[PDB]
C-alpha cells in the first residue's frame, strides 16, 4: 500500500524484470505517497506481482516542507538515497528495466538524482512520470540530462509549482486521475517498448 520496500528486501536469485522507484511528495507518509499505490497496481496488473519491484525512497528522504526551498528542490541527503536506490537496483538486478516516478518535491528529487546519475545506469530508466513538478519551469519541462521522449510531466494548469513558485494551490492535488491512467500507461508502454510481447 503506502510503504513499499521491494528492492530493499529483494533477493537477486529472484529478480523482477521491471523495477519501479518512486519519490513521494512533501508531508506524505510511508515512502509511496498518495499516488504511488495506484501506479504500483497498474504496473502489477500488466506485469503480475512477480514481474515488477515497487520501491519507494525512504531513509534520508523526509518529505519535509522547508526542503522544497533548498537550492534544487530538496536536500542532498534525499538526492543521495534516491541515487543509492538506483545503484542498488542496478547492482542487485542488472538485466532489469527501470522506471522512476515522482510527485511534488518527490519529482524535484527524482530529477536531481537522475540528473547526476551514472549515465550508464541512467541509460536504463525507460520512463519517468513527474506529477506537479515543482521545478517544471526552471528545467524547461525536462529532467535535465534525461531523454525528453521519456519524460511525462503531469503539470496540471492551476498548479503553481509548474509555473515558478512554492505557492501550493488546489490543482496540485488533482493527480489521482492521471496516476491511474496516463502515468502507468506511459510506463508500461515504455517498458514493453524495451522488452517483448
UniProtKB/Swiss-Prot annotation:
InterPro entries: AB_hydrolase_fold, Cutinase/axe, CUTINASE_1, CUTINASE_2, Cutinase_monf. Disulfide bonds join 15-93, 155-162. PROSITE patterns: CUTINASE_1, CUTINASE_2. Its EC number is 3.1.1.74. One of its GO terms (biological process) is carbohydrate catabolic process. May have promising applications in chemical and textile industries as it is capable of hydrolyzing a variety of substrates including soluble esters and insoluble triglycerides. Can hydrolyze and thus modulate the surface properties of synthetic fibers such as the plastic poly(ethylene terephthalate) (PET), or the textile fibers polyamide 6,6, polyester and acrylic. It comes from the Eukaryota. Keywords: Disulfide bond, Glycoprotein, Hydrolase, Secreted, Serine esterase, Signal, Virulence. GO terms for molecular function: cutinase activity. Optimum pH is 8. It catalyses: cutin + H2O = cutin monomers. Optimum temperature is below 30 degrees Celsius. Optimum temperature is 30-40 degrees Celsius. Catalyzes the hydrolysis of complex carboxylic polyesters found in the cell wall of plants. Degrades cutin, a macromolecule that forms the structure of the plant cuticle. Allows pathogenic fungi to penetrate through the cuticular barrier into the host plant during the initial stage of fungal infection. Belongs to the cutinase family. This is Cutinase 1. It comes from Fusarium vanettenii (Neocosmospora pisi).
Amino acid at each position: 500500500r503506502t510503504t513499499r520496500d521491494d528492492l530493499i528486501n529483494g533477493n537477486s536469485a529472484s529478480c523482477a524484470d521491471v523495477i519501479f522507484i518512486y519519490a513521494r511528495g512533501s508531508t506524505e507518509t510511508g515512502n509511496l505517497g498518495t499516488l504511488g499505490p495506484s501506479i504500483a497496481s497498474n504496473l502489477e496488473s500488466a506485469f503480475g506481482k512477480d514481474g515488477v519491484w515497487i520501491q519507494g525512497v525512504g531513509g534520508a528522504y523526509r518529505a519535509t516542507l522547508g526542503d522544497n526551498a533548498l537550492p534544487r528542490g530538496t536536500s542532498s541527503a534525499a538526492i543521495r538515497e534516491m541515487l543509492g536506490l538506483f545503484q542498488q537496483a542496478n547492482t542487485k538486478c542488472p538485466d532489469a528495466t527501470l522506471i522512476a516516478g515522482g510527485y511534488s518535491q518527490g519529482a524535484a528529487l527524482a530529477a536531481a538524482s537522475i540528473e547526476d546519475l551514472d549515465s550508464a545506469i541512467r541509460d536504463k530508466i525507460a520512463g519517468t512520470v513527474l506529477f506537479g513538478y515543482t521545478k517544471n519551469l526552471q528545467n524547461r519541462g525536462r529532467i535535465p540530462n534525461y531523454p525528453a521522449d521519456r519524460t511525462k510531466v503531469f503539470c496540471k494548469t492551476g498548479d503553481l509549482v509548474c509555473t515558478g513558485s512554492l505557492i501550493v494551490a488546489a490543482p496540485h492535488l488533482a493527480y489521482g486521475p492521471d496516476a491511474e491512467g496516463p502515468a502507468p500507461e506511459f510506463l508500461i508502454e515504455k517498458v514493453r517498448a524495451v522488452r517483448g510481447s
